[model samples]
Target: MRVLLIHSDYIEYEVKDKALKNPEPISEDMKRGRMEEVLVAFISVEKVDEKNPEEVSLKAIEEISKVAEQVKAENVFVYPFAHLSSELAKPSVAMDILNRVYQGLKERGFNVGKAPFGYYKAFKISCKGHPLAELSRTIVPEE
Candidate 1:
């Protein structure tokens, strides 16, 4: 998984049309969403992660939380942004892996929600300019 974390004052977006062959079914509310004082995680699940999505998901959480905790952010927005890598997983595997990360974040008690998968989106991000504001990580399944 390729994850880019940004500490932001707020992030808001409305979904547009589909971008992939198939995307997750979305509700009306999910069509538009926003979060305040959030850590926006722009993620791209790689084809290699298909070997063990669960492990990648867990490791991703560990990496995410490490930065989130340091940034003093409890709100997380899991965003699936495929452009981070060329070897991204197809929609089904990408959606599954993203859902695991989203659900895990919720279970861990962070105020979390994910941007809808498979849509072109328009977003407004007021990211912080601190030294730790923008960071990127690559999470791989155990070898």
Candidate 2:
């Protein structure tokens, strides 16, 4: 799995049409998401992650938490993005991993939110654009 973390002044997203053959379900309340001074975790689950999704989810959460603390962000967003890797995991598997990261972060006490997977989203981010504002990581299962 790969993670691109962005420290943003603010970010907002509105659910649009489906990007995949079948997208996760969403409700009226979940149609939009917004946060300020947030840590946005743009995660792309690759083919290799299918072998051990849970392991990578834990490690990914650990890494995200580390960055969020240093950046002092009260809100976190786990965005399942496909463009980061050409060999991306299948939709359902990727959904599971990203959900794990989303839930794991909340369990760790950071304010976290994630939208339904496999949707085309209309989104915007006002990145803080500091030294640590834009960062990336490749997370793998431990040998």
Per lDDT, the best of the predicted structures is 1
lDDT of 1 by residue, 1-143 (tens): 89999999999999998887667888899999989999999999999999999999999988888899999999999988998999989778899999999998888889997898899999999989999999999999877
Q: Which pairs of residues clash in candidate 2, taking residues 3 or more apart in a chain or in different chains? A: none
lDDT of each: 0.91, 0.89
Q: Could you give candidate 2's per-residue lDDT for residues 6-102 as a string of tens digits?
A: 9998778998888878888778888898888899999999989988999999999999999999999989999888889998898889988988999
RMSD of each: 0.8, 1.0
Give the clashing pairs for model 1.
Answer: none
Model 2 bad stretches (over 4 Å): none
Model 1 weakest 10-residue run by lDDT: 18-27
